[PDB]
Design a protein around this ligand. Structure first.
Ligand code: FES
Ligand code: FES
Lengths: 94, 94
């Protein structure tokens, strides 16, 4: 799928298979998106989904309210469609 | 030295030896601060020094203007005094 990342330094477009995490695809495309635990247990890789859908079932930090609002932990999220994500949204959680 | 980190989720205080990078000390203290390259070549770990001094000689992403304004790449920065850093300042560079 095509993933459109709206990052502080600009928009980036990458290709990410349905069985690859968004963060992993971004790294393979030469981007340096933020992370820490890479295990769905913090909010360092948090973004916000603006279009499309993700599957982030292994995450455990976000509550249902936050996911409901579009928050995504990019280290454990697969795209299930083309997706637009606003990156660097950890602060928006607090 | 004592490092005061002003993070989205609150203030944290950690101890960081003069020969340990701020990010490494933070991780040892159980914090999950953002990073990517861990090599001073991106801005994912960027913060802003509000008090004290750091040595970040191995960094290579920030220009002298940015460092002049207090920006720090925490993955390759040593404290040379007690330091207060505002974390998650990558967006402030762009
Ligand atoms: S890096 Fe910790 S949840 Fe993604
Ligand atoms: S993580 Fe890339 S400069 Fe620190």
């Amino acid at each position: 799928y095509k993933v459109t990342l709206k990052t502080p330094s600009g928009e980036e477009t990458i290709e990410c298979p349905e069985d690859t995490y968004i963060l992993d695809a971004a790294e393979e495309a030469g981007l340096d998106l933020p992370y820490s635990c890479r295990a769905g247990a913090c909010s360092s890789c948090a973004g916000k989904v603006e279009s499309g859908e993700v599957d982030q079932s292994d995450q455990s930090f976000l509550d249902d309210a936050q996911m409901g609002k579009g928050f995504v932990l990019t280290c454990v999220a697969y795209p299930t469609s083309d997706v637009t994500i606003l990156t660097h949204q950890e602060a928006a959680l607090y």
